[PDB]
Amino acid sequence: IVTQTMKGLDIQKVAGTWYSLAMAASDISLLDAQSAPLRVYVEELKPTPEGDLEILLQKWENGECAQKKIIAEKTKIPAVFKIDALNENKVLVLDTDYKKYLLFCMENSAQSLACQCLVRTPEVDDEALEKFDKALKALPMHIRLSFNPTQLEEQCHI
Amino acid sequence: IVTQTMKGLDIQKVAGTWYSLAMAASDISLLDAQSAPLRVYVEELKPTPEGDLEILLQKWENGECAQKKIIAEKTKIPAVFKIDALNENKVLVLDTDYKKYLLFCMENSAQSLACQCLVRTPEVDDEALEKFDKALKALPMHIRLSFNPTQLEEQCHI
Ligand SMILES: CCCCCCCC/C=C\CCCCCCCC(=O)O
Ligand SMILES: CCCCCCCC/C=C\CCCCCCCC(=O)O
């Protein structure tokens, strides 16, 4: 929890478009409603030249699908990034083939936890979903969501 | 969908106390919020002497955890029951050992679908959860919830 990170990660190679195909969290309230705190839909990853990672996403806030831009700073571990605000909050990359799928988790350091299966394409990748499910049997997840290709082409999935 | 029913079911032997340990549905909106349509927490099963099955449950309605009593009428198939209202709505018993776990699904006949893993006890039965997960890989589920022992002893899980 979480003791699965990607060895040999080249962060530059994750740049580009991603779809949040499936989400899971340790507590139901983290993903329950459209405005739940960790219900965030990844749009694009943009690594900076110094190795930080800026993230474009959508979040439902106040009855509307809002755009967000957040910055995840590099640490000494290539697969681990930190986000300010307030509580120390780390992003861990568990696995990726760069070209098709990426699995990551977000945990508050230090209890609470959310993971996603990102895919390059608005398609149900059964095989990325299988790897996501395997990575999660090691974790105490209590809500799990997945989306279909129609919803994946909509803002806030929708 | 759903093509898994329990052979040899003795409905009388499912009477008694049950806990809704985990829930899954084909559409996110079926389980999303506390007031979602299929977010129902089983309390007790009471088979009638003629083989019908009355169900006591809780549902969050209008900012409160309400008690419900619904009747599921027997069909020609021992593992399949029907509920009036409005849309023909069947309950199917997939598997049970009577003493520990029961898996069932509710489907609108005929599209939409929700399944639960019921347990006799406010304990996480990993082995019933495994069987639930196996029964579901055959199904198009897009939301899955589970509850911990604390929540299981609360009204509306809570
Ligand atoms: C390298 C894998 C990609 C990682 C993408 C990480 C996703 C974004 C991480 C955390 C977002 C947490 C929710 C914050 C939403 C913005 C502020 C808020 O509304 O609370
Ligand atoms: C034999 C296995 C036990 C089956 C228990 C079935 C659970 C109850 C079945 C369907 C309930 C569907 C929701 C209806 C809630 C009451 C009316 C409403 O608020 O819409």
Curated annotation (Swiss-Prot), chains A, B:
Annotated compartments: Secreted
UniProt keyword annotation of Secreted present: yes
One GO MF term attached to the UniProt entry: long-chain fatty acid binding
Disulfide linkage: 65-156, 105-115, 105-117
Post-translational modification: Alternate disulfide bonds occur in equal amounts in all variants examined.
Listed Gene3D superfamilies: 2.40.128.20
Source organism superkingdom: Eukaryota
Pfam families hit by this protein: Lipocalin
Keyword flag Mitochondrion: no
Tissue specificity field: Synthesized in mammary gland and secreted in milk.
Gene Ontology terms: cellular component: extracellular region
Keywords: Allergen, Disulfide bond, Milk protein, Retinol-binding, Secreted, Signal, Transport
Subunit details: Under physiological conditions beta-lactoglobulin exists as an equilibrium mixture of monomeric and dimeric forms. Interaction with LMBR1L which mediates the endocytosis of LGB has been observed in PubMed:17991420, but not in PubMed:23964685.
UniProt family annotation: Belongs to the calycin superfamily. Lipocalin family.
Purpose of the protein: Primary component of whey, it binds retinol and is probably involved in the transport of that molecule.
Protein name: Beta-lactoglobulin
